[PDB]
Subunit: 391 residues, 3 copies
Amino acid sequence: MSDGNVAWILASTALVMLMVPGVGFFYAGMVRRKNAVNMIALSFISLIITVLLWIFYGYSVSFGNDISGIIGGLNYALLSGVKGEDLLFMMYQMMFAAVTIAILTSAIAERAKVSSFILLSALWLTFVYAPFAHWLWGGGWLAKLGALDFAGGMVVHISSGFAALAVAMTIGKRAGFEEYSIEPHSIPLTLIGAALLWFGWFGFNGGSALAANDVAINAVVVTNTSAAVAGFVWMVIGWIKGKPGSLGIVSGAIAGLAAITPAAGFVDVKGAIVIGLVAGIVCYLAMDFRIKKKIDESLDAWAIHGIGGLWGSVAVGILANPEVNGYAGLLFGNPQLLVSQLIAVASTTAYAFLVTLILAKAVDAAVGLRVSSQEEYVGLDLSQHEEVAYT
Amino acid sequence: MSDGNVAWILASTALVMLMVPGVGFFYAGMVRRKNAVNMIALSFISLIITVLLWIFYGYSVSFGNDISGIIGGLNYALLSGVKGEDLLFMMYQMMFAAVTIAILTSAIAERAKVSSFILLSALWLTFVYAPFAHWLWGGGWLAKLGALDFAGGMVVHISSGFAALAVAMTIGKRAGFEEYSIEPHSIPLTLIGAALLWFGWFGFNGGSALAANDVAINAVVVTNTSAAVAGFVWMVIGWIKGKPGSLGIVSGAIAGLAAITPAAGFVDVKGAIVIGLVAGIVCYLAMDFRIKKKIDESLDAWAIHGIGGLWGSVAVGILANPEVNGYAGLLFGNPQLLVSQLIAVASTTAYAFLVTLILAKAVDAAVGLRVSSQEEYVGLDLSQHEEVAYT
Amino acid sequence: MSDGNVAWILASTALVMLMVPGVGFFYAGMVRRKNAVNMIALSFISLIITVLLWIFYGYSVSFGNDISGIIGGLNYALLSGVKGEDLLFMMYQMMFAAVTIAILTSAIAERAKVSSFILLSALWLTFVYAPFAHWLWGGGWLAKLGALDFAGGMVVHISSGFAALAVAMTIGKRAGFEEYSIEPHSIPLTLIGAALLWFGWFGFNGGSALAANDVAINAVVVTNTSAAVAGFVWMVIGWIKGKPGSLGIVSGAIAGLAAITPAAGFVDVKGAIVIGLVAGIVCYLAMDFRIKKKIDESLDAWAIHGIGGLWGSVAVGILANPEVNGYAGLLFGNPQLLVSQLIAVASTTAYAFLVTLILAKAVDAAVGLRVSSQEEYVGLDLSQHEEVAYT
């Protein structure tokens, strides 16, 4: 099977798995001390829950026999009939789902019942993630329309980003969100998370070529390029508005990483530079706007991943370079690829937001998403885990 | 030599090396602030000491010319006559030894002299680890009886687990262990360690196939499966007894990882599910029991690794699937494989505990294992390292 | 292109990238709480700035058309004409530059303007790093004289080490540096950085063979060997002078890693043992000496990397083993290789120090390197980033 290709994907799988707790640390540092354990714990639970549902039926529903082009069958339930390289693909994809669910916890920071999060996550993975993966990567209707998504601009970033906006609107603002600002309890912990996310993204984008080839190498080059450019943009914006906070710098880098994800294997370094530059700008504007609208989409999964994934996914249809990986976008003579991307971006953006809204409200009505006021006050570490982060 | 296979093992080696300080962080977060540096430092010392002894003679004593089937000769001392792929195997195995020694520090948490730990570790590596590795992986008597151990269920987990129980009983309870409970100074630091251990285990179990092949891929699938199931079990037990603490969740995942280690390359996903489920249950019962017996085996190396490695090693003889890697267990028609495992588990469990007990007491008599009461009071960071963790 | 070789280098690239924030954490734990974010932020900025300059022209100036043997042309600007494996080489080398710049931040700990650091870094990368890389690795004059540098003993360690000494002397001592000692705010954070640096060094030295072969395997064996020996030396020195602090242990390991870097692919285990042992000793003496001279080269980039890289680079000419990788040093009959190393070490050491001194003073005159006294007092987290590390 080419030991080298299996070697690279085995490693890329480990790298993406690390990104799950990586998201947890990234977010934990931005919430209050009394919620530090909860924020981290949520990412580990996201991993555990995803592994189980994925092998049980999540993998099958995503990449199984296509039915009407919107979802897969159950022929791969419990991995029945999944062997050889399919098992490695299954494993690799499993981690994309896990990271997606973790990114989503941004919207429930500091005020959700763990049990309700588990319920909603299982429903979301089933009715939003699996479908998306199938549409684009499982021979679904979007792939048929000619839409592309190299590493998850829509499957992972738009889905979690817009799903996060809907959840934030359903669960409500944290107490004191509008009156007083919430200070990050540990920026260093967040920076450790940021380091693990940049590192693991080598496997996220670089492993999506499913081989140690020229496409993987290109994906690694443009991924670092877009991250650097977008991170630089936020640094400049920071100086323009005051001082360059470290949170802004890494948030900018992640915007660049999310935007380049859908295009990593189709664009050149110059295209990567444009994607990162625009990503840095549009994502910053999105953050300021949701803040102005007073929406407590806490850790900006929407502004960074949602908007970052949206731009990047559209950018594919504009900048795809034929000399890089065969596909050509608008600027390279093919207006058709741009239309496929817009259809894909429009579909996934609307479904993610609207279906998540339905799922959130449903769970809220069935069991209640938010913790009591007193638990929010004492913190979820004590309330939901009976633990104290630091002594 | 197949660049792909060397690529995967070179990477798996780096991954296992990371697990050494990973254990240090995992444990450091569970002890008091005044002992944080000591707990971490012990894992780095474990690495440094292991590298030196291994190249000097540890590697040879483990995989050198067999003498009577219980130990290897000195033909590989100072790596004399070790080249090519043997050097990569030597390097990879070196890290398993290091992680094993680090896991063991669980038993001396907060009250051991660093010098004595170094002395005991060198003796243990020599008279317990090297022998075990040789018996099972160096063509020793256990391998001859037909016993199997894919990634270290006995060599690494039973050995450190039961060695930890003996050391805990020899060194004694921490001051105030029985009167008052010791609070973890930093659960987030422990969660960072847990993230690094799960990540590195991709190289631990996945690299034991010694190639980027279908066995490695299978090992990676079942390893994540068992971890998820056992982690889920502890989460449920947590809710049943109160709230799901994050420590319980990751401790459960590690139980699953330790239990699947001896079987990662021989069982299927369904077998992995049973191993993880039982691992979660038996390891939790073991923790409650050693606690009830008031044994201060501090960070539960015994309950998690000892008992987890024991079950998993026996499970190999029950669930090994011929279609996975040729070997068949009791449930697949071969009762012979189960008997080989029981003999191997019975031998390694008794030797680890009894020989470690002799070694611990010997070192205790020769130099004294435990620090003075005043040093235990002020903490080992100041007392043994003249350092203060946080300012 | 051999999927296995691309696999190993793709992974080695991710590993070296992780070392950049790794340096940040390593250093952050050693400075005061009020400067924790600044120290970490500097490493992320080092990464972002390096990625941009490298693709823009840094890569070309280092490995482009040679002009007079001292620098490369601009034929590779914006990666023009860089494809296939050259892109992977470009990516891999990019990270060496980033780590080098991060190591350098040792000299400006707690008192530099971020803007000035960015300016100086861009100038340094242009006039010191690019030249060095070209001289030794880009077919420059030093490579022509027969000088060798396997993974960066001179390109990365001597350059940052001596550049750090010059910068420290230009920017001046931190307030209270001579009167009172600065306590590390978080040794555990530093130990997390040390763990990431040891881990990533598998890709640093092991990936420099540019293939998953016997040279990579050898590099990995001797790299861990030298680290262990030098780390052991500092532990012993620690006990001789009091107690073995964890900072001393990991600082010793890093000295061993820096010293073995230039020789990783040319020496045997016995040579690695000598290099690590001497590295441990000479680097400790260098630290004590710069301290005695009251030079506030804060986090000892000079004593560890500068002196460690110098010894190691010279050691190559003494211990290179023909049976390992063809090259032979003085002890193996070839006095010629030693002379090439001394010329290379003498040139890079003098240029790094003198040119950096010119660059530092120039930037200081143009914009001012040091922050105001009040900003140094309140801390750079607030002053330069308007952030507070912990709440």
